[PDB]
Homo-oligomer: A and B are copies of this chain.
Amino acid sequence: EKQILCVGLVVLDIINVVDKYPEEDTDRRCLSQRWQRGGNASNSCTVLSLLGARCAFMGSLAPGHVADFLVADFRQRGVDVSQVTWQSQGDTPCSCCIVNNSNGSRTIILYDTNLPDVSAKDFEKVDLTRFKWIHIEGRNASEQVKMLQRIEEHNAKQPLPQKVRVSVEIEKPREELFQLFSYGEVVFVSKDVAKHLGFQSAVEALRGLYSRVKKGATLVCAWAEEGADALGPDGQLLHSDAFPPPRVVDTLGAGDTFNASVIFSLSKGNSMQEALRFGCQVAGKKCGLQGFDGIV
């Protein structure tokens, strides 16, 4: 009955599949175009739902056609959005994406602004006993640090079988987000963050960044087509190769698929080695199809 909660961003992705990258100053038909619910935390809710886990999303929405599409899509997947922060006004962000079918490239034109992120005041109203796992996409670090501290104070009063497991994603190389390294039992660190901090390989990143994580936590670093690596308190450097499809056609959300699949596998009691393998398997399969529905 307990759900998995993901806190972070939801956007509307308008995805244009093309057979060649558009030439500036021209008009040309795409191969296909679709509206797709996006955002890191939102995409991980999609994959968790497809994998069979009841999950909830916490993010910001503003009234309009965009939010109406997103709410209906959330409902279709069975993702709980009762804790979404509804802003009085604003523009729900929309990403225009160009997916080149010929070379597998992914180009994202991101919205110029975002709605205000979920506040710690917002998060304080959440009944934490509803959830066995809470994943936070690193965005507004000062507010999210307070959220993570609230979960720690909650867990201090709970016995072992009723503690809420926590994971965080640190994807953008913004110094403020690095306060999140010291929270959660699993920390997903992006390749962009690793390179920004001076590491040019997943193995180097784990060795160099492990001192930042909380006592007993596991650091996870996915490295695109090179697979994914992890380092936990037992001191073993773990690695899974990627599972590339015969033809890479859609990598948008592949990292979100990896994140959700690792969470799913760990929530079912699997080892980090198996969860890393499972995450690359599901994410690699996703890269060979459009959207997420085909991962099954």
In the bound complex, residues from chain B placing their C-beta under 8 Å from that of A22 are 98, 107, 109
Residues A33 and B106 in contact, CB atoms below 8 Å apart: no
Does A153 reach chain B (CB closer than 8 Å)?
no
Name the distance in Å between A14's Cβ and chain B's nearest Cβ. Answer: 6
Does A16 reach chain B (CB closer than 8 Å)?
yes
Given A24-B21, A25-B106, check contact A30 B100 (CB 8 Å). no
Does A31 reach chain B (CB closer than 8 Å)?
yes
Does A27 reach chain B (CB closer than 8 Å)?
yes
Q: Copies of this chain, how many?
A: 2
Residues A111 and B14 in contact, CB atoms below 8 Å apart: no
In the bound complex, residues from chain B placing their C-beta under 8 Å from that of A112 are 29-33
In the bound complex, residues from chain B placing their C-beta under 8 Å from that of A33 are 94, 96, 109, 111-112
Considering the complex, give the chain B residue whose CB is closest to the CB of A100: B24
Residues in A lying within 8 Å of B, measured CB to CB? 14, 16, 18, 21-33, 35, 65, 68-69, 94, 96, 98, 100, 105-112
Could you show 16 A-B contacts with beta carbons less than 8 Å apart?
A: A14-B14, A14-B94, A23-B107, A25-B105, A25-B106, A25-B107, A27-B110, A28-B108, A29-B109, A30-B110, A30-B111, A30-B112, A32-B112, A33-B112, A35-B65, A96-B98
